[PDB]
């Protein structure tokens, strides 16, 4: 009873992004890696801890830079933009 599946990155639903983004936006400072944040977001969202944790690392690494540069109250920790995003055609 094998299960057909494919390995490829994908973005989470808009509803999950809004709730996940709202938490990060409200807690941009203490956005640093933490089990309490990952566990709290995991219970709030219908995604697994691994999905939220991996998404948090990527989303945070692409969201903090924009908010930190836009504000400028504490710019640090990987200031990279939205992870490349220089492709366009």
From Swiss-Prot:
List the subcellular locations: Nucleus
DNA-binding region as annotated in the record: 12-67
Disease named in the record: Holoprosencephaly 4: A structural anomaly of the brain, in which the developing forebrain fails to correctly separate into right and left hemispheres. Holoprosencephaly is genetically heterogeneous and associated with several distinct facies and phenotypic variability.
Give the quaternary structure. Answer: Interacts with SMAD2. Interacts with CTBP, SMAD3 and HDAC1.
Family membership noted in the UniProt record: Belongs to the TALE/TGIF homeobox family.
Question: What is this protein's function?
Answer: Binds to a retinoid X receptor (RXR) responsive element from the cellular retinol-binding protein II promoter (CRBPII-RXRE). Inhibits the 9-cis-retinoic acid-dependent RXR alpha transcription activation of the retinoic acid responsive element. Active transcriptional corepressor of SMAD2. Links the nodal signaling pathway to the bifurcation of the forebrain and the establishment of ventral midline structures. May participate in the transmission of nuclear signals during development and in the adult, as illustrated by the down-modulation of the RXR alpha activities.
Q: By what name is this protein known?
A: Homeobox protein TGIF1
* Whole-protein residues included: 171 to 248 of 401
